[PDB]
Structures are given as structure tokens and as C-alpha cells.
Amino acid sequence: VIKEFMRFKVRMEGSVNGHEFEIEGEGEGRPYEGTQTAKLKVTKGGPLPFAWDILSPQFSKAYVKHPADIPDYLKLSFPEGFKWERVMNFEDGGVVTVTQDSSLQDGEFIYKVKLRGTNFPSDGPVMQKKTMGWEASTERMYPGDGDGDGEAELKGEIKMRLKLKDGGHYDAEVKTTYMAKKPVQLPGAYKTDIKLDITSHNEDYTIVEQYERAEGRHS
Ligand SMILES: [Ca+2]
Numbered sequence: 001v002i003k004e005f006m007r008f009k010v011r012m013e014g015s016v017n018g019h020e021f022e023i024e025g026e027g028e029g030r031p032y033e034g035t036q037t038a039k040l041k042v043t044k045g046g047p048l049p050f051a052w053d054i055l056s057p058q059f060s061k062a063y064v065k066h067p068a069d070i071p072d073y074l075k076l077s078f079p080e081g082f083k084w085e086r087v088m089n090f091e092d093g094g095v096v097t098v099t100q101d102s103s104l105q106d107g108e109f110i111y112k113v114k115l116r117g118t119n120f121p122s123d124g125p126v127m128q129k130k131t132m133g134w135e136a137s138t139e140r141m142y143p144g145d146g147d148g149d150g151e152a153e154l155k156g157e158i159k160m161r162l163k164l165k166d167g168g169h170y171d172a173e174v175k176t177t178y179m180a181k182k183p184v185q186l187p188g189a190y191k192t193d194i195k196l197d198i199t200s201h202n203e204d205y206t207i208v209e210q211y212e213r214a215e216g217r218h219s
Contacts, residue, residue: 001079002062006031007108010038010059014115016096017127021045025059027210031075034065037199038210047204050117051131053162056196056210058086058098058113061178064192065215071187073154077180079104085147086176088160094120125162125170134196135161135169139176141216142189146177152186154178192216 005028012023022044029036038059042048061084066072074082081103088096094117101112120126137158144155158174193215200209 001104002031002075004030004032008060008111009108010111010113012055012058012113012115016050016117017120019045019049021048027060029063031063032065034063034215035213036060036063040208042206046206049127051126051129052205052208053131053133054096054117054126055115056198058115059210060111062109063214067216070190070216071185073180073184073187074178076184077182080181082181083179084176086174089173091171092121092124094126125164130165131170132163132165133198135163136193136195139192139194141192143186147179153180154186189219190216191219
């Protein structure tokens with residue numbers, strides 16, 4: 001059901017320091033090649049009074065290139081799909097939590113994202129829009145119980161680095177649990193290299209285009 005070319009649709013509802021918003025978007029890519037693009041539109045609550053960059057990594061791990069010796073847990077979860085839950089802890093105290101549901105309907109992926117950002121300084125780089133994109137990341141993947149029910153799924157850990165407009169970087173520690181909706185064979189531990197780029201945007205970041213490349217490899 002996962003073709004060499006696949007489209008997706010995404011909707012995000014969220015709030016950051018109490019500012020509520022909604023985003024709708026579409027994307028496409030080559031799931032076995034590890035490449036994808038997305039175009040997002042702020043449909044409620046725009047222009048956003050915070051950095052787009054804290055949202056960009058929440059808009060698609062079915063598009064990770066895996067070698068044949070790493071079981072592709074998230075691709076194998078389809079057509080039913082998978083869920084993921086994420087916590088990002090930023091170095092100045094900010095917190096972002098996310099829940100996501102991924103399914104396959106009528107030939108395209110459907111992504112439903114819920115996001116809450118809290119504990120951000122009112123004068124910090126996120127609420128003042130003083131960031132300019134993510135450095136490349138390496139996510140450490142490993143089997144484990146992330147939702148506390150005693151049964152293993154797939155976990156990921158990342159140290160992410162956000163570029164600051166004034167120079168230097170703003171770090172976040174990220175933990176994600178990925179849960180297939182049906183029993184799927186789990187891989188052993190491995191690493192995924194990821195780069196997410198903002199490829200275009202309008203003046204107030206109410207229309208934004210993204211490009212991501214991701215590839216798994218042995219540790
Ligand atoms: Ca579990």
C-alpha cells in the first residue's frame with residue numbers, strides 16, 4: 001500500500017503559551033528514497049506570535065529510507081498506521097508536547113497532529129521569532145515501552161539544535177514514542193540522520209513550504 005510515490009494531508013491544532021491556532025497542509029514524497037516536501041497554511045490564529053521552527057518537525061517517518069537489514073516498523077504498520085507522542089524540552093525551559101495519528105485513506109497518508117507549547121519565556125527566541133531553522137539531526141532509535149503499558153514499541157531520542165538569528169544555537173532534548181496500531185516486528189537499535197529545510201514562506205509565515213530528507217543506518 002506504500003507506493004514509491006505517496007501523498008499526505010495533515011491538520012494540526014495547537015496552542016503555544018496559550019495562543020491557539022490551526023494549520024492545514026499537504027505533502028508528497030518518495031518513502032523508500034527518504035525524501036518529502038510539505039506545504040502548510042495557517043487557517044486559524046495567524047499570523048503566529050511565535051517561531052514557526054517549533055512546529056516544523058511535527059509535520060512523517062513513513063518517508064525514512066531504511067536499508068534492507070533494518071525492519072521498517074512504521075512502513076509495516078500500514079494500512080492501519082501508527083501513532084506517535086513527543087516531548088521537546090528546550091534549554092531555556094520551554095516545553096512542546098505532541099500527539100499524532102497517522103493512517104492511510106484513499107491512497108494518501110492522513111496525519112492528525114495535536115500540539116501544546118508551554119513554559120516559554122515571553123522575551124525568548126521562540127516567542128520573539130528570533131530563530132532560523134534546524135541543524136541536521138541524528139535520532140537514536142531503539143525498541144522499548146514508551147507509553148507505560150509494559151509492551152515494547154519504537155522509541156527515539158534526539159538532541160536538536162535550533163539556529164538563532166543573533167548567532168549560535170538553541171538546544172532541545174526530544175523524546176518520541178512510535179506505536180504501530182497492529183502488531184509489527186520491531187527493529188534493534190539504529191540511527192536516523194535527518195535534515196529539515198524551510199524552502200519558502202510568505203512574509204508572515206502563514207504559508208510555508210518544507211523539505212525533509214531522512215535515512216536510517218546502523219549504529
Ligand atoms: Ca507500550
